């Protein structure tokens, strides 16, 4: 019943190959719903989920103005940060921003988020009070001072507690048939001898939404954390996700192993075994 909205901004310089590319994508939970790319033939905000298509031209135009202006601002920001780190104009650099709001199961604001990174490292983040900043280094302190002087945190807070929550609630309603539907994992266990005396048991979860899931192996009821090979949860391309966990076991001990699956969509947690 808990939900979040996030926008993810990536601004990437590329000296000798034009001005920095700016992309923005928006998500509700694990569902992308919009994109903007300054490298598109005709840059404009585009729908990426069916439930957003109902928004009118004013919406799309508003978004497009925001992202076009951000495109220019982030180019200035990239110039600024190159100088804060005394970097040459030769290299390519990236600013990333992810921000948004989390709602609890009652649709109330749980907390806001607004974090930025430079070249893949924490740079500056708005604290949970939505009023103060945490700067990673002396370069980010320059940004912090500039944002404190301009009372930027106040602007972020007003958005995070206002429009962010309002529109997230709107999207959740408009896309309720999918956004508020948890699809449980379809599961099974496979068995593959690796030699005369060992075999691989692999526990599968497929077709689940949202991506959050817990998949573990136990032996005689004990967690096999170190012995379990766990792949990263991965998108199927139909909105759903997949994951597996594997353990190599002594031939003949298969029945001592149990796979445990926790997921929002599940009536109740599953325990599964290999079934020859």
């Amino acid at each position: 019943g808990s939900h979040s909205m996030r926008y993810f901004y990536t601004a990437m310089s590329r000296p000798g190959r034009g001005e920095p590319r700016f992309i923005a994508v928006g998500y509700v939970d694990d569902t992308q719903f919009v994109r903007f790319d300054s490298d598109a033939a005709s840059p404009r905000t585009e729908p990426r989920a069916p439930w957003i298509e109902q928004e009118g031209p004013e919406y799309w135009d508003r978004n497009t103005q925001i992202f076009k202006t951000n495109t220019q601002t982030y180019r200035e920001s990239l110039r600024n940060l190159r100088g804060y780190y005394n970097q040459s104009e030769a290299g390519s650099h990236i600013i990333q921003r992810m921000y948004g709001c989390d709602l609890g199961p009652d649709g109330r604001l749980l907390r806001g988020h607004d974090q930025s990174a430079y070249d893949g490292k924490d740079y500056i983040a708005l604290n949970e009070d939505l009023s103060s900043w945490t700067a990673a280094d002396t370069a980010a302190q320059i940004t912090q001072r500039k944002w404190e002087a301009a009372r930027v945190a106040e602007q972020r807070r007003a958005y995070l507690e206002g429009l962010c929550v309002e529109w997230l609630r709107r999207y959740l309603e408009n896309g309720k048939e999918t956004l508020q539907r948890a699809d449980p994992p379809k599961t099974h266990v496979t068995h593959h001898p690796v030699s005369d005396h060992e075999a691989t048991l692999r526990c599968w979860a497929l077709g689940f939404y949202p991506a959050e899931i817990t998949l573990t192996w136990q032996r005689d009821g004990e967690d096999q954390t170190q012995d379990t090979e766990l792949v990263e949860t991965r998108p199927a391309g139909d909105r759903t996700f997949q994951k597996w966990a594997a353990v190599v076991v002594p031939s003949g001990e298969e029945q001592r192993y149990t796979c445990h699956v926790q997921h929002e969509g599940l009536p109740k947690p599953l325990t599964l075994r290999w079934e020859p």
Binding site: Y7, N63, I66, N80, A150
Partner: peptide
């Protein structure tokens, strides 16, 4: 909806 533009110039990093 993303964060809107402020009344004046947005503040760069």
């Amino acid at each position: 909806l993303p964060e809107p533009l402020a009344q004046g110039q947005l503040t760069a990093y």
